[PDB]
Amino acid sequence: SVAYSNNSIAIPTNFTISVTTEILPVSMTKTSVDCTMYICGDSTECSNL
Amino acid sequence: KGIYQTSNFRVQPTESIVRFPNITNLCPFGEVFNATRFASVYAWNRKRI
Ligand SMILES: *[C@@H]1O[C@H](CO)[C@@H](O[C@@H]2O[C@H](CO)[C@@H](O)[C@H](O)[C@H]2NC(C)=O)[C@H](O)[C@H]1NC(C)=O
Ligand SMILES: CCCCCCCCCCCCCCCCCC(=O)O
Ligand SMILES: *[C@@H]1O[C@H](CO)[C@@H](O)[C@H](O)[C@H]1NC(C)=O
């Protein structure tokens, strides 16, 4: 509860130097896919289809 | 101009091998398909091969 009044003010007499962390992702892993290897791995009939 | 992903490095087979068990005898084709008597269908005979 803030002690509000029409003629009262609160003024700081000191200060705190505070250091905080913010962590942000920037990049993800780059991937490549060989379709023939994934679907028809070393099968000539599957590769031809 | 640039760098392009190609297919993964393929190695072709050099020879074909076949590995079957040490089996000598022929299956009893004469006993199965040339039996003198055959069972009735209600009492059908089962033979292990
Ligand atoms: C303002 O705040 C600082 C730190 O919050 C006060 O410094 C401390 O003062 C006490 C008492 O003199 C010491 O025991 C601490 O070692 C001090 N800390 C540091 C980091 O210096 C300072 O006294 C405050 N000033 C006023 C006017 O309130
Ligand atoms: C004597 C029992 C043999 C058991 C063999 C088990 C493996 C199955 C292979 C096929 C055997 C029967 C093939 C029949 C040949 C048919 C020829 C035709 O089309 O006239
Ligand atoms: C089938 O059985 C008959 C009667 O025993 C025989 O004459 C014939 O040679 C047999 N055939 C084969 C392929 O074994």
Swiss-Prot record, chain B:
Changing residue 37 to T: In strain: Omicron/BQ.1.1, Omicron/XBB.1.5, Omicron/EG.5.1. Glycans are attached at residues 14, 16, 22, 34. Residues 10-26 are annotated as: Disordered. Attaches the virion to the cell membrane by interacting with host receptor, initiating the infection. The major receptor is host ACE2. When S2/S2' has been cleaved, binding to the receptor triggers direct fusion at the cell membrane. When S2/S2' has not been cleaved, binding to the receptor results in internalization of the virus by endocytosis using host TFRC and GRM2 and leading to fusion of the virion membrane with the host endosomal membrane. Alternatively, may use NRP1/NRP2 and integrin as entry receptors. Binds to host ACE2. RBD also interacts with the N-linked glycan on 'Asn-90' of ACE2. Cleavage of S generates a polybasic C-terminal sequence on S1 that binds to host Neuropilin-1 (NRP1) and Neuropilin-2 (NRP2) receptors. Interacts with host integrin alpha-5/beta-1 (ITGA5:ITGB1) and with ACE2 in complex with integrin alpha-5/beta-1 (ITGA5:ITGB1). May interact via cytoplasmic c-terminus with M protein. May interact (via N-terminus) with host bilirubin and biliverdin, thereby preventing antibody binding to the SARS-CoV-2 spike NTD via an allosteric mechanism. This is Spike protein S1. It comes from Severe acute respiratory syndrome coronavirus 2. The lineage of its organism: Viruses, Riboviria, Orthornavirae, Pisuviricota, Pisoniviricetes. The chain holds residues 310 to 358 of 1273 of the full protein.
